[PDB]
């Protein structure tokens, strides 16, 4: 008859279970550590060449080659050390919203308003970047994609689902359902066996790639979650929402830990990324600014104010040497 | 470092040749598999119109991609779940969005039980009756037109404009007007 009341009492069960295991907030314990101080990061490189606004970027495993996807219909592979363009990939669909650099460096992926994650080969036998595969099957715009390996890749789309793809066959191996809003971003765990997703329902879900079930669901945000990033230890993650607030969740705790917010910030968060150690929490904002947050004290540690438009994407290298920030001004800035 | 510089020079010359034809192209968004493309040419001016296909009804996220387009063609079925109020709410949300406050909108408009302000409404002097038009139908047409223009005018923040019409040359002239206004604004003249 009415199974919604059972769902509400199960919600009460879950909520009082989380409240029973809440002794002290992360702020109440992180006091013996010294403050991180004023983080003064300066612009080192300004990669020019993109024509339209840049929507996404992804560092390579070498921390030198980075791919950038701008809505002008181009995927430019930059050499951050020399500012040289290694590859310029013209796309069939100019409305790209995400891009992924494979950990092997042999392939690259991108997607957007077209419900297709196109895989481009970079190690051909003749010297030309060609389309190796075009993964189709989604019913919404491609918001984020991340390579599992040279043959597997996970995708998130606006159809409130996520999918695990087999590149060689072009088939969906696993489909992840459960979200009620447009999935905006995903973050692979360091083991690539789990991944979190951020949708437009102020919710975050922890997925199992081999099992295909929703393990945990995290609430606490008030608006659409626009960005998600795993902690370097794989036992926590941060989320960026439209409510002008970043929040840090823990997996084994199943509860929100920290709330990063200030009174003067009334603009939503677009991108989020941790440092190599997770001490600093880099987050891009709707205003033409990037705020550095102390993950253990929730105090703003520094500001990056080089971009002239909204920071659309944020990326930290694997070795934590530099930070790349893409904005709608068709420019990429490498900070250090 | 030598092959890097040569490949960089090649890529940059290709990017300039692409930039010319990119900035020499008009981009348009049509509202009303994931995306359909339509390219046409008017007076040798390149147009690139995009139609939304196979997308969910929640547009507050993917509509942000069209902030740099020349104009958003907003088609309304002006000819019952009160479709016109829903179209009005959609145009209102588009007009006050912080990312589309500079993007112009080309309004294409293809009894007083849902708008009681229709009885006391008066046909203004700006309303020119088309030839072969009865007073009541023209009054209703301009009534929906001014219902849209009141939302269009109740916002001082933004560079955008609204071009209502009751078909390719109309879009061409509106895009040319938008380009002229943007050039005048870049010179701080308008």
């Amino acid at each position, epitope marked *: 008859d009415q199974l*919604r009341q059972e769902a509400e009492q199960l919600k009460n069960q879950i909520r009082d279970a989380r409240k029973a295991c809440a002794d002290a907030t992360l702020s109440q314990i992180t006091n013996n550590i010294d403050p991180v101080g004023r983080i003064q990061m300066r612009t080192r490189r300004t990669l020019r060449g993109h024509l339209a606004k840049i929507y996404a970027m992804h560092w390579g495993t070498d921390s030198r080659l980075l791919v950038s996807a701008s809505q002008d219909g181009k995927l430019i592979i930059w050499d951050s050390y020399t500012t040289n363009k290694v590859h310029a990939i013209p796309l069939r669909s100019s409305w790209v919203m995400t891009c992924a650099y494979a950990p092997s460096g042999n392939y690259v992926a991108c997607g957007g308003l077209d419900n297709i994650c196109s895989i481009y080969n970079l190690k051909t036998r003749e010297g030309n970047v060609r389309v190796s595969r075009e993964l189709a099957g989604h019913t919404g715009y491609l918001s984020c994609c991340r390579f599992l390996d040279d043959n597997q890749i996970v995708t998130s789309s606006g159809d409130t689902t996520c999918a695990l793809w087999d590149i060689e066959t072009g088939q969906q191996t696993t489909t992840f359902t459960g979200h009620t809003g447009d999935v905006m971003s995903l973050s692979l765990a360091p083991d690539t066996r789990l991944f979190v997703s951020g949708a437009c329902d102020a919710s975050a879900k922890l997925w199992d790639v081999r099992e295909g079930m929703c393990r945990q669901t995290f609430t606490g945000h008030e608006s659409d979650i626009n960005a998600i990033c795993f902690f370097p230890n794989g036992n926590a993650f941060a989320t960026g929402s439209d409510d002008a607030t970043c929040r840090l969740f823990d997996l084994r705790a199943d509860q929100e830990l920290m709330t990063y917010s200030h009174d003067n910030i009334i603009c939503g968060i677009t991108s989020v990324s941790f440092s190599k150690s997770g001490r600093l929490l880099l987050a891009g904002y709707d205003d033409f600014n990037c705020n550095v947050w102390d993950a253990l004290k929730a105090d703003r540690a520094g500001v990056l104010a080089g971009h002239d438009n909204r920071v659309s994407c944020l990326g930290v290298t694997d070795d934590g040497m530099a930070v790349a920030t893409g904005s709608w001004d068709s420019f990429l800035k490498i900070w250090n | 470092e030598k092959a890097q510089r040569e490949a960089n020079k090649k890529i940059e010359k290709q990017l300039q040749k692409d930039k010319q034809v990119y900035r020499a192209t008009h981009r348009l968004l049509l509202l009303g598999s994931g995306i359909f493309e339509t390219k046409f040419q008017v007076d040798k001016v390149n147009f690139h119109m995009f139609d939304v296909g196979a997308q969910r009804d929640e547009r507050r996220k993917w509509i942000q991609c069209f902030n740099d387009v020349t104009a958003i063609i907003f088609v309304v079925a002006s000819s019952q779940t009160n479709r016109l109020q829903a179209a009005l709410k959609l145009f209102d949300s588009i007009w006050n969005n912080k990312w589309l406050r500079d993007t112009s909108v080309i309004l294409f408009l293809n009894i007083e039980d849902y708008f009681p302000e229709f009885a006391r409404y008066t046909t203004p002097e700006d309303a020119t009756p088309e030839p072969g038009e009865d007073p009541r139908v023209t009054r209703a047409k301009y009534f929906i037109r001014d219902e849209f223009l009141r939302i269009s005018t109740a916002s001082g923040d933004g560079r955008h404009y609204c071009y209502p019409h009751f078909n390719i040359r109309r879009v061409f002239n509106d895009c040319r007007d938008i380009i002229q206004r943007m050039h005048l604004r870049q010179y701080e003249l308008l």
Partner: nanobody
Amino acid sequence: QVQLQESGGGLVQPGGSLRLSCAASGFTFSNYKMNWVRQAPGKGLEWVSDISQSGASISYTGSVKGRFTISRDNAKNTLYLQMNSLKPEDTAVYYCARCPAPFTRDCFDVTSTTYAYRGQGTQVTV
């Protein structure tokens, strides 16, 4: 956790008068815009009324303006809809909608399907 659970609603006489209460929780009620949406049987979602954060900017749909009254009490985080002079066409499931963008004039996707930040609705038969 946004719940937005609504109270009130029921079978009433034609031309009667009731009021619906929209209990808000899990978000700052003073920072978000509120909306009233209904879904009559066999029809789609329809926008009824809304009210800004301050409570001054007020807009109804034409079929209910002058008849219904939108109001909010930011102290108790509740939204009111004083229903007056009801008609059999008002029979619908009235939902309390809250678009997710705070401090914004644009208010998106409140009348959308599969849309969160909306209550389960209360049947108002008339």
